[PDB]
Ligand binder design. Sequence first.
Ligand SMILES: O=P(O)(O)OCCNS(=O)(=O)c1ccc(OC(F)(F)F)cc1
Ligand SMILES: C=C(/N=C/c1c(COP(=O)(O)O)cnc(C)c1O)C(=O)O
Ligand code: NA
Lengths: 268, 394
Amino acid sequence: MERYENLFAQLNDRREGAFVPFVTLGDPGIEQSLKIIDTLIDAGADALELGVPFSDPLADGPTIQNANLRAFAAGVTPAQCFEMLALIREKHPTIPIGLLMYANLVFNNGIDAFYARCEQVGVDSVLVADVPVEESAPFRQAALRHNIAPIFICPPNADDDLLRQVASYGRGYTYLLSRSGVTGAENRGALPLHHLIEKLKEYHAAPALQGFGISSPEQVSAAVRAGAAGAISGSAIVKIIEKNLASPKQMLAELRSFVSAMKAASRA
Amino acid sequence: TTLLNPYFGEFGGMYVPQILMPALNQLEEAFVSAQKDPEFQAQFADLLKNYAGRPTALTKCQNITAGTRTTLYLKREDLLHGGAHKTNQVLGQALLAKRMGKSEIIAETGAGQHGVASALASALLGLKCRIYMGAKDVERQSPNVFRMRLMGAEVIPVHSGSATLKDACNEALRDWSGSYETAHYMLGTAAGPHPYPTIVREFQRMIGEETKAQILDKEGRLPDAVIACVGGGSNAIGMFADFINDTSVGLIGVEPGGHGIETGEHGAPLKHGRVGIYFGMKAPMMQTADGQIEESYSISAGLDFPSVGPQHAYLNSIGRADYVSITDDEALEAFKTLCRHEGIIPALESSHALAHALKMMREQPEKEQLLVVNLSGRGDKDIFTVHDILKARG
Ligand SMILES: O=P(O)(O)OCCNS(=O)(=O)c1ccc(OC(F)(F)F)cc1
Ligand SMILES: C=C(/N=C/c1c(COP(=O)(O)O)cnc(C)c1O)C(=O)O
Ligand code: NA
């Protein structure tokens, strides 16, 4: 399908950036998670990044580690995440859906079968966080065979040859890291270096979404001002879940209010 | 692109976030340079000899093989400064850190011998050091925690997951991924992303080199087999490496069987896991049907790890090395036997290797065999654990 391409062309016309929340599927249970996700979309999410719970999430900080642990405490498996993704797609036919995966969950019982499953449920992209471009051949091949975009990462660390590989191998969107470290809202990243955004554009890479440490509307506006196509916020959204576990109604209300404020700031 | 092969057959690789690839490439380049630099080699050899106390003895057992056709030697890594083989490759990696201009060290530890090693090397060589340790291991290996702090290292308890070595490794890598500009990650086993399995092997290979010279001197022939415990794989690959091309020499690696393989409470992924991708490498690991990483178990903290280094997975695959397991109770008997009959108190990790050699002898007592066990560490750290068991045992 062409969901990312369609989204970006539409935002471009509207003079808008994308606002993309992340949550962990199944946090804090299957039913409430589905409600959170519909809430995120109703509140103006342009795309989704959705994490599958993983036992040892080495690119994640404590907030998202505890989101993983909540889902496991609800008994959430990858199979149940796939059930959720199918239901989410059925409700929302055009929103681009990206997964945040760790390699072992993709490799577990077959790389090909993993991407085939993503295609079946209507996922658009997969970002495997611990597979660098150097190791990515079997992943990108399987992704493309099943009409899934493989997402690659552009660090602030990025040299030229990496820029070119990322532009060639990646599809859908290019990920722009805000900073080194792991996910977390209490570690604020830097302004998107306008060097990389320029070079990415030069090499006709998929449009960039900046991620890590984005937790405020001011940071979303800033990413767009910097030439990025959009911004991803995970820990900030997850902390609203964490704090409202005994108040699932207030949880949703707060999610709605925050997402709306973040999306409003993406309008240029 | 890399200078050296990151894989051993199908195992190994560099499965880290893209952010970390420059750090790995820089480390590999520094290591390749250092390996060909006579000054680096002289500095490393000087520290090993005059600070760490190499070469270590090879001790013939006087008493435990009586009445059999086994001749058993113990490679005395328990006599190395710090009390275990971990000291060797820390001194090399600390010198690499310096060559690269890094001023801080990160390390993980289970038994606390790598943490002790990292802190002592950091004190000697003027580096600021921080050590991750699972909260469970903080407790069962507590002599080591005190040691680390006295040497000016920060020791950080990890409460996540099993609160053991795998959890310490996770936090160490989380940390490095934010701190690599100024910190070298001093990984303490022959596992993790390339180039660590290779560097750790090369910085431990004097174990086997010495063993070979010593056994030729004393016996006039190579061993029938060399036997080493396997957690992540450093002491074992250090003993094995110089013998790999000596096809007559058996290479036997011993994983922890814990309460027994059938219980699922063990640390023997090479033989009783399946291939996965975790901690920057493709390797056998203990995992759920769905590919969540399983928590391991061993009486010994150093072996309590649900993966294994990729070179061991490769040597097993081609049949060059054989891997077996030993249970907590087998390891405890070997511990007691060595204390009582040779006056050496072995680490509970090393006791697994000894227990397998004792089985090789006892099962076939008229088989002529010349064996070396890598006595990877001393068991001072374990005396409270063994006491508490042997008491509650009656
Ligand atoms: O807002 P924060 O700080 O919580 O960050 C949320 C990020 N969520 S995500 O799925 O895009 C994401 C993307 C990449 C990650 O690792 C990698 F960069 F190495 F690939 C981890 C998470
Ligand atoms: C986990 C640790 N020690 C492991 C260890 C091991 C197992 O690790 P290797 O497989 O890397 O040798 C063997 N022998 C001794 C004395 C050990 O202390 C550590 O010190 O952090
Ligand atoms: Na092992």
